[PDB]
Curated annotation (Swiss-Prot), chain A:
Effect of residue 323 to A: Fails to produce currents in the presence of 100 uM intracellular cGMP
Gene name of the record: tax-4
Protein source organism: Caenorhabditis elegans
Membrane-side (Extracellular) residue stretches: 47-95, 164-174, 230-260
Reaction(s) this enzyme catalyzes, per UniProt: Ca(2+)(in) = Ca(2+)(out); Na(+)(in) = Na(+)(out); K(+)(in) = K(+)(out)
Keywords assigned: Cell membrane, Cell projection, cGMP, cGMP-binding, Chemotaxis, Ion channel, Ion transport, Ligand-gated ion channel, Membrane, Neurogenesis, Nucleotide-binding, Transmembrane, Transmembrane helix, Transport
Protein name listed in UniProt: Cyclic nucleotide-gated channel
Membrane topology: Multi-pass membrane protein
Lineage per the UniProt record: Eukaryota, Metazoa, Ecdysozoa, Nematoda, Chromadorea
Residues reported to bind 3',5'-cyclic AMP: 458, 473
Single GO term (MF): protein-containing complex binding
TM regions (residue ranges): 24-46, 96-115, 150-163, 175-185, 207-229, 261-283, 284-309
Site location (Central gate): 301, 305
Swiss-Prot record, chain B:
Binding site for 3',5'-cyclic GMP: 268, 271, 284-285
Positions in the Cytoplasmic compartment: 1-17
Name of the molecule in the record: Cyclic nucleotide-gated channel
Summary of the tissues where the protein is detected: Expressed at the sensory endings of thermosensory, gustatory, and olfactory neurons.
Residues annotated as binding 3',5'-cyclic AMP: 269, 284
Binding site for Na(+): 88
UniProt-annotated stretches for the region C-linker: 128-205
Effect upon mutating residue 112 to A: Impairs activation by cGMP, likely by disrupting the central gate
Outcome after substituting residue 134 to A: Fails to produce currents in the presence of 100 uM intracellular cGMP
Top-level lineage group: Eukaryota
Residue span of region Selectivity filter: 85-88
Residue range from the parent sequence: 292 to 586 of 733
Length: 517, 295, 295
């Protein structure tokens, strides 16, 4: 009664992780159907043969040519194909263990389809940005959405009736009646989409998915080739599988079920990739099938390898865009006859810019993401530099959010000067990573060493006329090694400090303290 | 003009493009089939082993009748193997057959290279929006991997992207604002947004060209279910109209609801007005929190 | 794979019918008995495993193995004293760089790549009757980071970048075709040479035609040709016979389709980019010439 009162008001949340693992279970059941229904239809010895092979045999002791059951030496190097005669029970007295294994996996994937139909019946649709978890609303939105026809065609149990060898009717079974389970492709497409958005290795999943598409396409063309080779009649001509093919059954090669699937998979691999080193067709229907199969192979393998070439071109796209920028700069410095020390300074700057590779990757985040999530990313990355900065510890919090959205990075060389004594101050600097030194004009002796997190250049952009330099910089500033700088401009800081007057009174009072110090 | 005026007007344009290049393929292989059998008739059938005839032994094997269907079916197969440059046909014998097969194979290399290039572009373009979405997600996932962003912000960002692909009616205004004129963009802005324009308290009472000039300048921001839209002390620079979603006003720390701002409700218009009789001025009057996802 | 590179260590014993003896005896194969043979030669080991004849080839291989392992040891010492970049400057004090070496777990990558199993179990020892496993020197291939840094720091600094890109993808092509050549001859040795018509041997008839000797150069030259025809998917090689040859050729042809599709795609992009400025200039001139034609 506990599972009845649990299932009387169950409603599935589609956004959860347990539903995504259920879509992986439905993907496993769909891949089972997608391979083995056409393998069981075409290669019908997969469930047991249900017809004994009767080779013609000349025993020298009998001095007579009789039909006996084929051993493996009589399928090796044969002159004609074996004639099949049915069992009276259609092989159920010998191959019931294989047939109950196939029946158990068919019942397991149909129970997976039934539990997926029950989760469809209690699926929480998103109404106003929230999911609906009341039972009457989700069953009414199920019955109005016409999901029950897609769930109902994909569960017709024709395979349990007409899909197995029945001896009393002398029905040989139609396993292809389980092709209605392939209509549930929406759950598989949602599982592949919701896997490669959430995966930390997206290109590896893309390569695995197009490899699975390749193997499923070559497998379905393998079963299509062996269905036409069975329908024409095996061993009747030299394109069809059989003894006359001589690539299918060479010298000292047995004709087994593994040989049938392995040669049909090789034939579809050579046809769909259009290598074409297979026997040429004989009859006109074989010419029509090979012409249609080769044109389908040209078109869909052209697009599939085009996708694989794009996916392995995109695994190193950042390095190629970096190389196009370096090719443009190296061509420009070659044709303008720039001297050698500036060229080795520029390529050393680019070697540093690829060596650390945490410098400039903010562009797609500032494009597509909202400003609340961009602000939260700006909090979570830059927090060790935001915790030390003397203005940033004492402000309004929305003021520091509005300032931290407007920062930028400038990478500096180890010889480069950031400020000199007589430059006009238009930028305020925060040392994100690197070591700095103040020096004399020509004496070159250090006074203090501005470490990481130290802030300078904020009084040189302020407009108080009590400071005698005004817009001029107070000191020479030279970076020691390579230096990343959080660079706040004059204009954006003056806008954000125009919108907040009380912190402007505080920074003005700090200007009076540094003027009297 | 019929093919151009069909694929501008068709609701399935990529299916028509695929059907048209399949028809181009079949007409090119058919004309090369008739070209091969015209040269096989002109040289003389059955005179050597490249020409159609009894000496070919791929054209007429054992127990295969020579009919008109056999002539067209073998010539279509020969042009399918030559123009796609598989080349599993008999090698030429006389010099004019060598000249024809060399010219036909180079024409097959060039025009089937451009034709399958067009087919690869046309089936690459059938899922171009998903690949551009995946390039944006690859850039954001690489950025949050290398900067060591914590796990809850990463699952919030990929849940925002799962929502942004699940509804897929969020951000598709860019090509309409690029190429279309402003009268047709204004008429598109009337016909889509009409159920939200009919409820809004400023938009029911204005001049009509004023509401057209305002509705061309709107934008969409999608909000997370935990996100705050306003707090008590933010400066008001934006006026909001709830296109779809549920909103709630709350306390500063008590977190108790006062009213529930539904769809179509308008707020944030007094906080951007510059009247000094309101004591807050640019400051927001209330905390505003979205309940679920919110456009 | 080609284990006659260090000396054969097993003499080839062809069956031979001398007419003077009037008897069919097994003698050592000369070059006229490997030319046009009816069966493959049976191998019988030397008692010293070829060390009394091929010690000069084996000491040449031992000298080059010791030279590249000394290069690996000096590279491990430079890894042990490598100056990490702390604050934009490198650190040049010894205790800091050895402590940052032992904390970074570089010593496991340097230590797996220097296990001297090849000097013990990689050479033909006659007393144990150990035939040698040269594949135990595959641990030296784990140092790929220094090679990737050398190729990156070469093509940033090179004045001819596209020539270096073309030389690097040509080297990738030759190394991939060489590894597939050794993979084909390892499977042809494992199945047994000359047992069927796909395997290298006398029954292949593309590998050993009329008046072609079976040497080590013939083995490497035919295996390189087989991998060139398989990985570029021309496929003009003998079709497989046994099922494991069908599985290997199917897997090798699909790997050839995928990785040669991406490799020639990279080569087509790299030689499209050698004249990209001229093509962008030509697109601007095509637009201006079309505009001045239609107006
Ligand atoms: C497997 C190897 C068993 C060898 C039996 C054999 O090879 O039997 C084969 C046919 O059975 C099979 O292939 C059945 C293979 C499939 C088994 C069922 C698998 C169920 C699991 C589903 C997979 C789902 C994955 C998820 C016939 O050969 P036979 O020996 O029965 O009679 C012939 C002997 N003459 C020639 C001497 C007379
Ligand atoms: C793979 C199975 C390999 C088994 C090798 C040893 C068996 C053996 O070797 O058994 C052979 C006979 O094959 C068999 O019945 C085994 C049956 C194998 C059935 C293979 C057909 C599978 C088609 C189903 C679709 C699969 C989808 C996959 C998508 C890529 C005896 O050969 P023999 O002793 O007569 O010589
Ligand atoms: C297609 C027709 C298939 C009919 C099959 C049964 C006929 C049969 O089978 O009749 C055959 C003899 O073919 C015939 O005259 C039927 C004439 C069929 C003409 C085929 C050539 C068509 C070329 C025109 C261009 C078409 C453009 C299409 C672009 C792709 C008797 O064969 P049989 O009884 O001697 O053995
Ligand atoms: C080189 C040509 C020498 C011909 C010897 C010959 O061809 O010997 C070959 C095998 O040795 C070789 O290939 C060894 C070649 C490799 C030499 C070692 C190279 C060390 C340098 C490493 C390279 C690193 C580069 C960096 C066997 O022929 P065989 O005359 O010794 O006995 C057979 C004569 N039957 C048939 C009449 C009885
Ligand atoms: C290249 C060597 C060409 C030597 C030609 C004259 C030798 C000759 O011709 O000597 C032949 C016998 O080959 C030999 O043992 C010479 C041994 C050559 C070994 C070739 C295998 C090399 C595989 C190592 C991997 C190399 C990686 C390269 C990546 C592309 C006598 O032939 P014959 O006088 O019996 O007729």
């Amino acid at each position: 009664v506990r599972i009845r009162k649990y299932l009387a008001n169950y409603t599935q949340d589609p956004s959860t992780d347990n539903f995504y693992y259920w879509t992986c279970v439905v993907t496993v059941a769909y891949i089972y159907n997608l391979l083995f229904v056409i393998a069981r239809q075409v290669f019908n010895d997969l469930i047991g043969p249900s017809s004994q092979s009767l080779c013609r045999f000349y025993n020298g002791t009998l001095n007579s040519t009789t039909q006996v059951e084929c051993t493996y030496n009589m399928l090796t190097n044969m002159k004609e194909m074996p004639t099949y005669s049915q069992y009276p029970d259609l092989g159920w007295s010998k191959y019931w263990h294989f047939r109950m294994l196939w029946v158990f996996f068919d019942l397991l994937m149909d129970c997976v389809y039934l539990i997926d139909t029950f989760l469809n019946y209690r699926m929480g649709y998103m109404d106003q940005g929230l999911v609906v978890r009341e039972a009457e609303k989700v069953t009414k939105a199920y019955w109005q959405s016409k999901q029950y026809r897609i769930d109902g065609i994909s569960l017709i149990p024709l395979d349990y009736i007409l899909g197995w060898p029945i001896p009393y009717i002398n029905w040989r079974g139609l396993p292809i009646l389980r092709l209605n389970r392939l209509i549930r492709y929406k759950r598989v497409r949602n599982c592949l989409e919701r896997t490669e958005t959430r995966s930390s290795m997206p290109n590896a999943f893309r390569v695995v998915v197009v490899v699975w598409y390749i193997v499923i396409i070559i497998h379905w063309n393998a079963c299509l080739y062996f269905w036409i080779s069975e329908w024409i009649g095996l061993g009747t001509d030299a394109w069809v599988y059989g003894h006359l093919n001589k690539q299918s059954l060479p010298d000292d090669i047995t004709d087994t079920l593994l040989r049938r699937y392995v040669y049909s998979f090789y034939w579809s691999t050579l046809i769909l990739t259009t290598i074409g080193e297979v026997p040429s067709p004989v009859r006109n229907i074989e010419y029509a099938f090979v012409t249609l199969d080769l044109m389908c192979g040209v078109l869909i393998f052209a697009t599939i390898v085009g996708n694989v070439g794009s996916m392995i071109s995109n695994m190193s796209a950042a390095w190629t865009e970096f190389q196009n920028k370096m090719d443009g700069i190296k061509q420009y410095m070659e044709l303008r006859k720039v001297s050698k020390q500036l060229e080795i300074r520029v390529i050393k700057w680019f070697d540093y810019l690829w060596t650390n590779k945490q410098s400039l990757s903010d562009q797609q985040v500032l494009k597509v993401l909202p400003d609340k999530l961009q602000a939260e990313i700006a909090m979570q990355v830059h927090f060790e530099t935001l915790r030390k900065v003397r203005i940033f510890q004492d402000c309004e919090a929305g003021l520091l959010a509005e300032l931290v959205l407007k920062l930028q990075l400038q990478v500096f060389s180890p010889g480069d000067f950031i400020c000199k004594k007589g430059d006009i101050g238009r930028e305020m600097y925060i040392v994100k990573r690197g070591r700095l030194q103040v020096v004399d004009d020509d004496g070159k002796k250090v006074f203090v060493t501005l470490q990481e997190g130290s802030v300078f250049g904020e009084l040189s952009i302020l407009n108080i006329a009590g400071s005698k330099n005004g817009n001029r910089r107070t000191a020479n500033v030279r970076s020691v090694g390579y230096t990343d700088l959080f660079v706040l401009s004059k204009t954006d800081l003056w806008n954000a400090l125009r919108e907040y007057p009380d912190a402007r009174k505080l920074l003005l009072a700090k200007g009076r303290e540094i003027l009297k110090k």
